[PDB]
Design a protein around this ligand. Structure first.
Ligand SMILES: CCCCCCSC[C@H](NC(=O)CC[C@H]([NH3+])C(=O)O)C(=O)NCC(=O)O
Ligand SMILES: CCCCCCSC[C@H](NC(=O)CC[C@H]([NH3+])C(=O)O)C(=O)NCC(=O)O
Lengths: 208, 210
């Protein structure tokens, strides 16, 4: 019932793929090559002229976070009540802010800004360590005691930063244990080790 | 006393949309103004989750992130669509608004002088998606999604209004958006609020540019 339309990279689709895989959902991948994209017709039919695009039956959605929220809403990964839902949103928005900075670094000035970015990293990750400490001592998920779409988004963000700055999580015990714990979930573990994930570049420009 | 408290700098900025929402929905709220002096002192910043404002309090629930605040209000006040499908569409609209808002903010604080012309030239292409959304919903006669107002409407309204200040007449080429702004701006409570000193006398941005 699901179709994700995207370029052949993990990018902004990694988190939603992990979510679908971990939740045991099936989906079809519609790969869009740079050639096809530069042709122009697909772009013109996209609401904001960008991908990913997602189809749930006849519902066509755009915007990665909208897709995540939609899945969180339909699959029950949006907290147990309104208070938790608000907290889940707060976590996801924080993830999105840092993701934008990451994306900017990767595509705008990797060479020149990498050092400053890595130096500033600890300050950027602290908020998530704090959130974790306030939720049952970081023994469960980011919000509440059930997994939410924010968890998958945060997991991806942490994983790609471990590739960018190996060991950046060493100074954060809760985050470190969190990544290990989530990465150990049966279906997610199988997915993260599959060619489907491993053989796709993280970003489109060969930088990471 | 009011259950809501918005903590922010004395500017409209990322709080304009939520204020319009509260006002239009007849809600009461307390404004906790943070001056640049107080902020540079450091203690408040250190207590903020991501080291930034706005901050929002609903009873003992302290929230950060403007869009989280909007979604929370949309969820508790019933401004999030009539069902899941609409909720997804509302999110899609809001995310689009957020993307353009970031570009606007970047222009305003990063290089207003140098980039203003290019930005205004690219504007029509950026607004088209919203005109399209409007055309697909009862011919743009009601709201952005469905037939009931959502938090996305307030966010979009603010975005359109601030762009009308940046590039006067930018909405002329978009009949649906133009009528939409006029229609929403005419709602009783919202109209009263937009004309109040509380709104009018607050600068749009913090650096005096708009
Ligand atoms: C080519 C391989 C690298 C691909 C990089 C990732 S896609 C980047 C871009 N899409 C976005 O930035 C999506 C942003 C949107 N806010 C979301 O979160 O979904 C796009 O479609 N860009 C195409 C365009 O704008 O023309
Ligand atoms: C001073 C008058 C001008 C104020 C401009 C608007 S506040 C800007 C900034 N906050 C944000 O950018 C908030 C972004 C956040 N993602 C959201 O959506 O709420 C901040 O708190 N910055 C303070 C800091 O980072 O130290």
């Amino acid at each position: 019932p699901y179709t994700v339309v995207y370029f052949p990279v993990r990018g902004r689709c990694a988190a939603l793929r992990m979510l679908l895989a971990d939740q045991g959902q099936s989906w079809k991948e519609e790969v869009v090559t740079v050639e096809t994209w530069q042709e122009g017709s697909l772009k013109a039919s996209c609401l904001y002229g960008q991908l990913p695009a997602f189809q749930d039956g006849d519902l066509t959605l755009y915007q990665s976070n909208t897709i995540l929220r939609h899945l969180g809403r339909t699959l029950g990964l949006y907290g147990k009540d309104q208070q938790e839902a608000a907290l889940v949103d707060m976590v996801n928005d924080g993830v999105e802010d840092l993701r934008c900075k990451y994306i900017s670094l990767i595509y705008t000035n990797y060479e020149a800004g990498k050092d400053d970015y890595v130096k500033a990293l600890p300050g950027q990750l602290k908020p998530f360590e704090t959130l974790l400490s306030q939720n049952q001592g970081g023994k469960t998920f980011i919000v509440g005691d059930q997994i939410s779409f924010a968890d998958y988004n945060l997991l991806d963000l942490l994983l790609i930063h471990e590739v960018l700055a190996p060991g950046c999580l060493d100074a954060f015990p809760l985050l470190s244990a969190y990544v290990g714990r989530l990465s150990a979930r049966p279906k997610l573990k199988a997915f993260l080790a599959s060619p489907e994930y491993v053989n796709l570049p993280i970003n489109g420009n060969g930088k990471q």
